[PDB]
């Protein structure tokens, strides 16, 4: 069996120009490890960016699933 948090989910990241980028990942991934893959897809570094889900900033150490980030969940991207 593949347990909860280790199936592919596709998270939608939304920038300040209304562009969407889809990142395939696992619910068990930390926000930090999510940012690492995101950054390679969008041409930045994790330390240059902030992610928010519906108003609140996501902390690097905490998992996507703990923030209730699921397949097709939208996140808002900001650059420092």
């Amino acid at each position: 069996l593949v347990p909860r948090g280790s199936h592919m989910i596709e998270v939608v990241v939304n920038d300040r120009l209304g562009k969407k980028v889809r990142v395939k990942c696992l619910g068990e991934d930390s926000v930090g490890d999510f940012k690492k893959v995101l950054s390679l897809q969008i041409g930045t570094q994790p330390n240059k960016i902030v992610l928010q889900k519906g108003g609140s900033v996501l902390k690097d150490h905490i998992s996507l699933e703990d923030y209730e980030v699921h397949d097709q969940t939208n996140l808002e991207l900001y650059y420092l």
């Binding site: 990142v23 395939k24 990942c25 696992l26 991934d29 893959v37």
Partner: peptide
């Protein structure tokens, strides 16, 4: 913007657990 296969190349490089097929 990327397939599971391509995403996994990135994950593997970063030492993360792979996304199941």
């Amino acid at each position: 913007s990327l397939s599971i296969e391509e995403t996994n190349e990135l994950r593997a490089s970063l030492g993360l657990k792979l996304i199941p097929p």
